[PDB]
Amino acid sequence: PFFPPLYLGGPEITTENCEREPIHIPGSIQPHGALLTADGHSGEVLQMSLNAATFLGQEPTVLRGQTLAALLPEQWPALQAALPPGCPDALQYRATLDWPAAGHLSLTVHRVGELLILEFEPTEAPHALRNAMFALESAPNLRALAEVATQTVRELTGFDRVMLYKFAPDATGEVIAEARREGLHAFLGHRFPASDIPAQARALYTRHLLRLTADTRAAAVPLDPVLNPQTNAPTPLGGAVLRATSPMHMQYLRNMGVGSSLSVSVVVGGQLWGLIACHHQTPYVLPPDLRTTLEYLGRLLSLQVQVKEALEH
Amino acid sequence: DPLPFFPPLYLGGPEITTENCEREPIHIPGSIQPHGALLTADGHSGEVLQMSLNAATFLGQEPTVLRGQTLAALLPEQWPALQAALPPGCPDALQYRATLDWPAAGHLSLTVHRVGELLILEFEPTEPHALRNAMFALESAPNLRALAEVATQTVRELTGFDRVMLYKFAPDATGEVIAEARREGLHAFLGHRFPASDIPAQARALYTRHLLRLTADTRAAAVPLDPVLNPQTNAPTPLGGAVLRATSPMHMQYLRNMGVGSSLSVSVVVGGQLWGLIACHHQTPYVLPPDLRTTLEYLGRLLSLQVQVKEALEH
Ligand SMILES: *C/C=C1/C(=C/c2[nH]c(/C=C3[NH+]=C(/C=C4\NC(=O)C(C=C)=C4C)C(C)=C\3CCC(=O)O)c(CCC(=O)O)c2C)NC(=O)[C@H]1C
Numbered sequence: 181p182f183f184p185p186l187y188l189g190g191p192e193i194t195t196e197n198c199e200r201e202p203i204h205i206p207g208s209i210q211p212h213g214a215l216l217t218a219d220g221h222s223g224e225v226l227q228m229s230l231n232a233a234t235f236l237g238q239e240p241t242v243l244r245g246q247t248l249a250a251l252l253p254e255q256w257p258a259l260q261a262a263l264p265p266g267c268p269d270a271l272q273y274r275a276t277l278d279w280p281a282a283g284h285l286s287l288t289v290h291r292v293g294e295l296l297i298l299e300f301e302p303t304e305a306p307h308a309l310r311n312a313m314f315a316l317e318s319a320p321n322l323r324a325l326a327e328v329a330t331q332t333v334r335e336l337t338g339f340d341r342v343m344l345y346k347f348a349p350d351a352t353g354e355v356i357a358e359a360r361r362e363g364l365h366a367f368l369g370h371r372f373p374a375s376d377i378p379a380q381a382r383a384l385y386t387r388h389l390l391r392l393t394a395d396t397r398a399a400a401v402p403l404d405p406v407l408n409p410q411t412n413a414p415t416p417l418g419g420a421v422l423r424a425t426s427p428m429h430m431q432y433l434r435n436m437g438v439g440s441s442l443s444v445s446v447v448v449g450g451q452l453w454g455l456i457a458c459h460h461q462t463p464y465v466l467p468p469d470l471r472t473t474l475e476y477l478g479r480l481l482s483l484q485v486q487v488k489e490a491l492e493h
Numbered sequence: 494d495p496l497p498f499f500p501p502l503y504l505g506g507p508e509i510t511t512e513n514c515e516r517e518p519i520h521i522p523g524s525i526q527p528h529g530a531l532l533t534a535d536g537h538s539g540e541v542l543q544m545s546l547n548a549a550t551f552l553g554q555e556p557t558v559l560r561g562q563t564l565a566a567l568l569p570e571q572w573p574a575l576q577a578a579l580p581p582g583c584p585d586a587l588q589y590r591a592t593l594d595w596p597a598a599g600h601l602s603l604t605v606h607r608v609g610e611l612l613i614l615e616f617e618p619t620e621p622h623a624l625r626n627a628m629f630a631l632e633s634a635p636n637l638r639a640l641a642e643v644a645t646q647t648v649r650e651l652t653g654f655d656r657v658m659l660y661k662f663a664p665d666a667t668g669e670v671i672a673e674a675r676r677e678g679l680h681a682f683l684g685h686r687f688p689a690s691d692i693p694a695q696a697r698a699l700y701t702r703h704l705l706r707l708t709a710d711t712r713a714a715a716v717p718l719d720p721v722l723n724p725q726t727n728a729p730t731p732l733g734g735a736v737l738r739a740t741s742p743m744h745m746q747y748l749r750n751m752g753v754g755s756s757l758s759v760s761v762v763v764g765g766q767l768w769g770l771i772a773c774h775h776q777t778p779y780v781l782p783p784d785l786r787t788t789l790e791y792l793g794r795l796l797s798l799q800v801q802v803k804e805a806l807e808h
């Protein structure tokens with residue numbers, strides 16, 4: 181099963197119970213964005229991140245009464261149609277708001293049962309993606325495909341190190357390719373145990389395909405209330421990219437000397453084949469539109485991995 | 494019966510009938526569609542060899558001036574990028590794309606690929622979260638039918654085409670419209686079935702490698718290359734990888750007979766075989782700009798993946 185989260189007086193995680201930490205219900209988010217939850221029917225704002233006032237420019241109480249209808253007039257009917265009751269928690273809808281306080285915000289919404297989860301992040305506003313797609317397709321074998329993928333991602337993102345991590349049948353890991361800035365250690369060829377990406381983590385990475393930590397020293401921002409009014413239970417955040425990253429897993433990025441990280445899951449035959457793993461030495465908020473490019477690349481790599489593995493077997 | 498290609502018309506080959514369907518060399522027509530321009534150049538020196546006859550009017554230069562310069566001089570910023578992206582021995586399927594600001598012609602899209610020692614350069618005029626939203630909707634479709642319907646409707650919304658069908662090949666290469674989105678008033682093709690020779694086998698092989706072709710105007714005359722043969726080889730210039738390459742007159746006649754002014758399709762490729770086709774119709778001529786066509790190319794790949802996934806959920 182899982183332990184209760186901390187804020188419901190559950191045990192503090194260790195290296196003894198690595199498999200039961202509820203990474204999907206931390207009750208908090210990373211501070212480079214803001215999150216609201218809301219009722220599926222009424223559009224009634226039920227929870228907000230204590231930092232919402234910053235991004236939205238709204239007097240705190242104003243929000244926690246109001247309706248999405250009021251708050252987002254153009255958007256609220258689109259949401260209603262895009263995310264019908266009963267849809268999967270994996271389905272997401274995005275829009276760009278030209279919002280008074282903040283030039284442009286990206287809005288990302290998904291639905292978990294009766295709750296809409298809304299994420300707001302700063303945003304903005306060429307051929308590198310098309311060029312990359314053809315490059316991946318003409319790679320002659322899996323090894324070269326891995327090399328092209330890591331190089332392409334590094335060029336698109338500027339990340340200090342981009343690896344292709346591959347899981348063995350027992351969940352043992354292997355960096356099989358790596359693109360990195362001069363003057364970093366080389367993790368190419370190394371392996372790591374199946375514990376280092378635990379079992380509920382690989383389960384969530386199978387369904388929600390891109391997760392990231394923007395600053396390994398930033399404090400999480402609580403949800404208020406912490407419990408969903410609807411249920412008097414924890415809000416599932418597993419499909420939110422803003423959802424707080426396990427302090428366990430941030431402590432290990434710090435011990436490595438990483439200040440910003442990001443992965444895209446590579447899913448083949450319904451299973452987690454491997455990750456596109458990116459490292460930055462300093463804090464780094466990759467904007468939403470560039471993340472989208474990596475999300476596309478994730479799908480394309482998933483296709484090409486199968487194609488390429490089929491021409492060996 | 495499968496038989497080798499005839500020589501093209503310009504090398505004294507025969508004209509094409511219902512008898513000799515399978516034997517047109519559809520890849521080497523010696524000509525392009527008039528809404529863009531094409532140059533060929535030597536892959537090592539960058540000497541310009543062939544050009545479409547309309548090139549002066551896209552590129553704003555006399556032929557003899559174009560042909561008298563190397564790509565190093567014509568494309569000083571792109572020439573080194575081309576050479577890195579398209580190394581000798583690379584496959585003909587690999588494409589490099591850039592946008593140019595050309596004085597006389599505005600923003601041009603440049604698409605380049607390499608066939609042996611030849612570079613082929615295509616120039617076309619070029620011009621929010623719809624793709625991301627579509628990607629997730631496709632993935633959440635519960636079964637093959639719902640996927641097919643979401644895919645057709647999405648493509649129609651993105652493009653404005655009068656008719657978008659998903660066309661699926663059977664094992665005998667007969668096909669069948671399994672989903673479609675269509676303009677009000679058009680008659681349905683859904684569930685119809687069409688004989689194998691409707692898409693003959695020399696073109697199904699080509700659609701397994703080069704995943705997007707179109708006819709922008711089914712009455713437009715093709716524009717010859719000049720000279721017609723590659724001076725490197727005194728042989729035909731391979732245009733199977735060029736979206737501009739002129740479209741065969743037997744195909745063009747049939748689209749005309751169906752009342753179509755504009756066509757397009759992306760291939761859906763599963764396990765190395767052509768599974769089907771996102772076919773698009775418009776009643777009037779219609780040019781879809783290169784950046785919009787890129788969205789369809791990306792959807793072609795997504796759909797190939799999702800078709801595998803939906804079919805595996807099915808035994
Ligand atoms: C006692 C718990 C441990 C633990 C937990 C844990 N790990 C993740 C996710 C990841 N762990 C990774 C480990 C590596 N990072 C590397 O750079 C390398 C190799 C060079 C390895 C083996 C990786 C890559 C991930 C994926 C996430 C990412 O970095 O982008 C989680 C899940 C966190 C979340 O879902 O928010 C958890 C709880 N990992 C351990 O190694 C032990 C100490």
Ligand SMILES: *C/C=C1/C(=C/c2[nH]c(/C=C3[NH+]=C(/C=C4\NC(=O)C(C=C)=C4C)C(C)=C\3CCC(=O)O)c(CCC(=O)O)c2C)NC(=O)[C@H]1C
Nearest residue numbers: 510511514519682687691692696741743744756757758772
């Ligand atoms: C003697 C040869 C004949 C022939 C020539 C020919 N046809 C193609 C390609 C296509 N034919 C298609 C037929 C259909 N169009 C539809 O709308 C439907 C159903 C609703 C069918 C069955 C299709 C879809 C294609 C593919 C092209 C596209 O979709 O855009 C070619 C190859 C063209 C080229 O690569 O240059 C040729 C030479 N067509 C015949 O019917 C026979 C008599």
